[PDB]
Amino acid sequence: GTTRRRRGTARPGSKAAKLREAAIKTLKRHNAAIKSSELQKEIEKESGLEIPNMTTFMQSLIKMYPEVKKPYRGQYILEGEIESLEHHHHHH
DNA sequence: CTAATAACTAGTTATTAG
DNA sequence: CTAATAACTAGTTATTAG
Numbered sequence A: 001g002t003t004r005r006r007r008g009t010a011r012p013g014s015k016a017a018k019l020r021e022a023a024i025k026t027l028k029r030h031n032a033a034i035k036s037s038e039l040q041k042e043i044e045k046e047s048g049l050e051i052p053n054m055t056t057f058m059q060s061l062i063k064m065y066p067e068v069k070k071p072y073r074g075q076y077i078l079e080g081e082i083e084s085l086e087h088h089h090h091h092h
Numbered sequence B, C: 001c002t003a004a005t006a007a008c009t010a011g012t013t014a015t016t017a018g
Helices: A017-028 A036-047 A054-064
Strands: A068-072 A075-078
Touching: A017 A036, A017 A054, A036 A054, A036 A075, A054 A068
Parallel strands: none
Antiparallel strands: A068 A075
16 A cells, blocks of 8 residues: 555575475485576475575575586586585595 | 676575565 | 565666776
């Protein structure tokens, strides 16, 4: 109704932490590039729950984990062991 | 024409406010 | 839902700079 229509504001996600925890196992079962909406269907299979903002989440994942990369528009990849931040040793 | 700033187009859901 | 502000990918068009 009234003239005070402009109300909102925002910050990066907190529900998005559900994507971090599921996406690590979702991505470790692959070693190849995937689109946001294909990785969404894969995380929906992995977790059984809804998918927060893919662009903000996947860049939050990248800045925390250089093993994750962005080859194209909404297209992402995870290289090898995500534990490579402290797995300085060879593979088993 | 190559480079940077600015406005606009096409894509994607969140979280705050009510 | 209504309403905006938010964080991010990539390209066309236009002005300023060279």
